[PDB]
Write a protein that binds this ligand. Structure first.
Ligand code: OLC
Ligand code: OLC
Ligand code: OLC
Length: 203
């Protein structure tokens, strides 16, 4: 554990809280793709399955439980409460063409053919493309009412801090993860497309 994975996770957490609090106060999830939020909740579900097998630290367990509870609550706030503001007519990305290749990719490319390692690799590959339904929604409508600039800021700071996390990890520990780094580059390119679409079409 280093400071850039630490702050990157906190930056990742800050954005999730911003979106969860924005939907709650505005009583609205218009412009948000619940399919994307469902995928990010599936990411935390398959990434943190090690809670039923391995308790590492109180901080480590709390972050997992907070990540899971926060994105689960966002999904509840989109599909049950405030569902009258869910723009389901535009959140129409056929995500089966996404989880099936990602699932097959995690089945074939992993660090170990172990159940928990396969589902961790799935979460890493799924998290890299989970933003695709939301990008499909924004490009179609050109609108994203619930999306605020500072929500993007902590999304970019999160990916940018994991950029430093990869570098500090290699130079000070000799650790390098081809699977996570490659998927992270895919996630970063798509997240810049998120930021570019917001500036050019929304803001
Ligand atoms: C058990 C041991 C665990 C060890 C874990 C160690 C984690 C790294 C901690 C401190 C290094 C701080 C490095 C200095 C950071 C400087 C930041 C900086 O230069 O920022 C530039 C700024 O953004 C405009 O230039
Ligand atoms: C002796 C080993 C016992 C392991 C038993 C499983 C422990 C973790 C269960 C649920 C985590 C989330 C529960 C909901 C938190 C709110
Ligand atoms: C109005 C319509 C708005 C649509 C707005 C775009 C929606 C994105 C949909 C499809 C892009 C195809 C998927 C592109 C990203 C997946 C490809 C990928 O990451 O492949 C892995 C890499 O290329 C190998 O290492």
């Amino acid at each position: 554990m280093n400071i850039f994975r630490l702050t990157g996770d906190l930056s990742h957490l800050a954005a999730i809280i911003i979106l969860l609090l924005k939907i709650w106060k505005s009583r609205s999830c218009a412009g948000i793709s619940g399919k994307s939020q469902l995928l990010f909740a599936l990411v935390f579900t398959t990434r943190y399955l090690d809670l039923f097998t391995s308790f590492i630290s109180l901080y480590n367990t709390s972050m997992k439980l907070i990540y899971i509870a926060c994105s689960y609550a966002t999904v509840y706030l989109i599909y049950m409460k405030f569902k009258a503001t869910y723009d389901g007519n535009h959140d129409t990305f056929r995500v089966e063409f996404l989880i099936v290749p990602v699932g097959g990719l995690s089945f074939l490319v992993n660090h170990d053919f172990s159940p928990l390692e396969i589902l961790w690799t799935f979460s890493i590959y799924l998290e890299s493309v989970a933003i695709l339904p939301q990008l499909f929604m924004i490009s179609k409508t050109g609108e994203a009412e619930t999306i605020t600039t500072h929500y993007l800021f902590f999304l970019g700071l999160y990916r940018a801090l994991y950029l430093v996390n990869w570098i500090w990890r290699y130079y000070f520990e000799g650790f390098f993860d081809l699977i996570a780094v490659v998927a992270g580059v895919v996630q970063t390119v798509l997240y810049c497309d998120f930021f570019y679409l917001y500036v050019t079409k929304v803001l």
